[PDB]
Structures are given as C-alpha cells and as structure tokens.
UniProtKB/Swiss-Prot annotation:
GO terms for cellular component: extracellular region. This is Toxic shock syndrome toxin-1. It is found in: Secreted. The gene is tst. Keywords: Secreted, Signal, Superantigen, Toxin, Virulence. It comes from the Bacteria. One of its GO terms (molecular function) is toxin activity. Belongs to the staphylococcal/streptococcal toxin family. The keyword Secreted applies. The keyword Signal applies. Responsible for the symptoms of toxic shock syndrome.
Length: 194
C-alpha cells in the first residue's frame, strides 16, 4: 500500500524518544555536544543546523527531549553512550504546565483531540514539537499507515506573528532547524493530513 519512504517515516515517528532533565555538559563543540545524564549515561548529540548551535558551556545543566540515530552502545567499561540528534534546552520551567492547543484536520474534517500532552518547560526545540505532534498523528489519526494519509503539514504560529511548519511528507529538516522557542508564546498549533 504505502511506499518505503512513508514506511521509514512511520518507523521514525513510531519509535520513542529520550527525555532527560538536568543533564550536564561534558563538552561543547561545533556541531556536537557530549553530556552525562542523571542515570550515568553519556549522550553524543549532533546539531547540524547553523541556525541552532547550542552555546552551553561545560558544567551547565540542560534538558533532553531528543531522538536516537544509532543504537546506543554498552562499552567495554560498561559506560552507556547514546547517539542522539538535536534537542537540548535550558532547565527552565514554567510555574505551571500549560495546555498546548493542537488542531488537526483529516481530509477536511476537524478531528477530535486524543493523547495530546501538556508541557512544563519554558522552551522546547522545534524538532521536539515535531516528534510530539507527528507521533500524535500517527497513533491517533493514522498518518503513514495508509496510502491516503501520507502528507500535509503542521504549523505552529507564535504570539508575535512568526510561524514555523513542516511538510508531513518528508522527515523533519534537521539541518535548517531554528533554535528552541517558548511554548508559552505559542498562539496556535495546526496540523493537516492529506
């Protein structure tokens, strides 16, 4: 029914994601970051976008809401190394968790909301909002599980006017990814499957 391209997407968005708080920066380089988590694992996260180059200095606490690219490895010394991409932010929290408003429209009709989260962080990376949204669409609305639901777009619109979006027919454009944004400044989140 669907093609390999759409199958790969579904595998991507139907796998999980690592969530970690107050991790610590071991080293920050150009295009990369090495960090240690509260559970003792090291992460090697790559940042390929010139528009989103984390400026955390060694010693700082950070948050992870990232996706792995390779299979993590248990080393000879038993240290656990994760191979993730994008998704580092500051440990700031909002005094209370806010209700992000997601609006989906499947083939014209405004579809009901199910499973949709509520976040407590001041800021989240966009690729994160991308995995949270699209994952919702795959489980609940059938995105990538049928030939007739393999496209469309999500579009976050900020309070200041500025917007961000992604085409559901391709994987998130990691290399042109902007820096994290304040989820408390998101006015509306739209999604549309076609």
């Amino acid at each position: 029914s669907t093609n390999d391209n759409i199958k790969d997407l579904l595998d991507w968005y139907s796998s999980g994601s690592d969530t970690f708080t107050n991790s610590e920066v071991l080293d920050n380089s150009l295009g990369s970051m090495r960090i240690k988590n509260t559970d003792g694992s090291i992460s090697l996260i790559i940042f390929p976008s010139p528009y989103y180059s984390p400026a955390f200095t060694k010693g700082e606490k950070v948050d992870l809401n990232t996706k792995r690219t390779k299979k993590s490895q248990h080393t000879s010394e038993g240290t656990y190394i994760h191979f993730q991409i994008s998704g580092v932010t500051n440990t700031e929290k909002l005094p209370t968790p806010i209700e992000l408003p997601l609006k989906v429209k499947v083939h014209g009709k405004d579809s009901p909301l199910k499973y949709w989260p509520k976040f407590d962080k001041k800021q989240l990376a966009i690729s994160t909002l991308d995995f949270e949204i699209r994952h919702q669409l795959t489980q609940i609305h059938g995105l990538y599980r049928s030939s007739d639901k393999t496209g469309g777009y999500w579009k976050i619109t900020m309070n200041d006017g500025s917007t961000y979006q992604s085409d559901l027919s391709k994987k998130f454009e990691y290399n042109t990814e902007k820096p994290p944004i304040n989820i408390d400044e998101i006015k509306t989140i739209e999604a549309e499957i076609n």
